[PDB]
């Protein structure tokens, strides 16, 4: 019983400390049923989408462009579904995911770390220690934003108020 | 036995004859899903049988309009 995060559940068989953020948290059987590389790739993609979504949820409420009407983010999804901008965003996300398919195929073969697209224009994470610290921060922020975006969306669906609009004048249910 | 393009395309789908999982496999999951299906069938049967009224559900021709 040495899972190191849940003391009574033991370390999972393939959850060695090779991966960043590996605290042994896998109570249900998922790493023993699916490839860990694919799981890490899916985790990073979900978390990056969630981080961008949380930042967008803040910014769109705080400021919307001179163009487009003043809308809440969910109403924004509906309006851009009916307008055509959502189709453009879906088209370009699908275009990037077309090569993401090949990247995941490589990850299945090897020669590519899960979630590694070699995207680093500003030249950050110089030296390995800084890279490991940034990896840990990235994974933690990814999971936190994965929880937070669902929190934002379900709270808007329940209270009919946006997040910072809800922070003041809470109006408890 | 004739070899064909469609035959070799579909051959792996008909390759693991008699291959079985170890003892009892995923039987409890199948039993649980069958129990859920039985409950669902009972619900829908009692709905039309009128022995079960849920809300805003009128089993009647007049509900058409």
């Amino acid at each position: 019983d040495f899972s190191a995060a849940v003391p009574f559940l033991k370390r999972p068989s393939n959850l060695d400390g090779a991966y960043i953020g590996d605290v042994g948290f896998d109570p249900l059987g998922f790493s023993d049923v699916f490839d860990l590389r694919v799981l890490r790739e899916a985790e990073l993609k979900h978390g990056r989408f969630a981080m961008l979504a949380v930042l967008g949820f803040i910014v769109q409420e705080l400021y919307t462009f001179p163009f487009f009407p003043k809308m809440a983010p969910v109403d924004a999804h509906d309006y851009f579904v009916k307008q055509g901008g959502g189709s453009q965003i879906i088209f370009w996300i699908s275009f990037v995911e077309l090569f993401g398919v090949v990247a995941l195929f490589e990850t299945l073969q090897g020669k590519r770390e899960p979630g590694d697209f070699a995207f680093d224009p500003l030249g950050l994470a110089k030296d390995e220690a800084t890279l490991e610290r940034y990896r840990l921060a990235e994974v933690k922020h990814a999971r936190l934003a994965m929880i937070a975006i669902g929190g934002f969306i379900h709270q808007y669906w329940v209270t009919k108020q946006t997040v910072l609009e809800q922070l003041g004048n809470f109006k408890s249910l | 036995a004739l070899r064909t393009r469609l035959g070799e395309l579909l051959r792996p789908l008909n390759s693991e004859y008699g291959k079985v999982a170890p003892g009892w496999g995923t039987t409890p999951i199948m039993g649980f899903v069958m129990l859920l299906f039985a409950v669902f069938l009972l619900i829908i049967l009692q709905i039309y049988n009128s022995s079960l009224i849920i809300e805003n559900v009128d089993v009647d021709w007049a509900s058409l309009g």
Partner: peptide, 26 residues
Amino acid sequence: PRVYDEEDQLLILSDIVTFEETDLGR
């Protein structure tokens, strides 16, 4: 993700139960 039943299940037993003949039957 990261055994064969080996039973025919199409087999009739197909074993003939022989009956002997006695002097009375002869």
